[PDB]
Structure formats: C-alpha cells, structure tokens
Amino acid sequence: SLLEFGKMILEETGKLAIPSYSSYGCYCGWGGKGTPKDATDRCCFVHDCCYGNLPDCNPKSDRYKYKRVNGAIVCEKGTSCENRICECDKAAAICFRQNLNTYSKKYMLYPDFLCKGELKC
C-alpha cells in the first residue's frame, strides 16, 4: 500500500513521498504519459510498469510487511499480490536512492502538455 511505499521512500531517501515524488515529471504520482524527464522519472515509469504487471492486485490499498536486514529491504511472506507489490515498491525506493544526485526541483509540479512521446513498458 501507499503507507508502506511512502515510508520506504522516506527511509531510503530522506524525502517525503508527498510532495517530492507525488507530482514529479511525467510519471511520479497521478497517471503517466510521454517520455520520462530524467532518471527519477524513469524510476516512476518502471514502477508504473511493475504495477501494470499485476492487473488483479490492488497496490495502493493492499498492505504488505517488510523489514530491514542490515540496510537491506526484505519483503516478508504475504499473499502472492503483496509479495509482488512489495518487490515493485522496493525497486522504486532503491532506484530513487540511486538517482538522488540528479533529482531536480525544476520537475516538481511538472505541467501535463509537456509530457510528450510514446514509451511502452
């Protein structure tokens, strides 16, 4: 769920999911269209794709459990949906952490009409 995902992001990056990552670029947050603007936006794109692989899971509302084994995020055993949601979210958090250096405030609240292009998952 968004509860788990938001927490993961904050632990990982030190930034609050809302509003650092809820309206960044073309893909972070509501919907997705166009070509991702940067590395961070590509993480959101890949994350949307990941969820897109689970048409009968409910990633926003279904809660899973995870723990940290030393630094590392480890998804705990739940239903099959919970496990796969968790792996999607975990990958996004790490991707965010890996691209914190190129994160750009210029892309916060990015206007929709500038999200142009086709990108398939």
Domain containing 68 — which CATH number? 1.20.90.10
78 is in an annotated binding site: no
Tokens for 8, please give them: 């993961």
Between the alpha carbon of residue 20 and those of residues 24, 77, 99, the distances in Å are 7, 30, 13
Q: 3-class DSSP state for residue 66? A: strand
When divided into structural domains, the chain yields a total of 1
Q: Specify whether the CB–CB gap between 110 and 20 falls below 8 A.
A: no
User: Any catalytic annotation for residue 89?
Assistant: yes
**Is 112 tagged catalytic?**
no
**Separation of alpha carbons 45 and 25, rounded Å:** 10
| Residues listed for the chain | 121
- The answer to whether 48 is a known ligand-binding residue is yes
Contacts by residues 14-23 (CB-CB < 8 Å, ≥ 24 positions apart): 15/103, 19/108, 20/103, 20/108, 21/96, 23/108, 23/109, 23/110
6 marked among binding-site residues:
no
Cα separation of the two ends of the chain: 22
Selected catalytic residue, list 47, 56, 62, 112? 47
Cα–Cα distance, 29 to 24 (Å, whole number): 7
Q: Which of 38, 56, 89, 112 is catalytic?
A: 89
Residue in the block written with tokens 């790490």: 94
Identify whether the C-beta of residue 34 lies closer than 8 Å to the C-beta of residue 45: no
- Which range marks the domain in which residue 119 is found? 1-121
The tokens for 103 are 């994160």
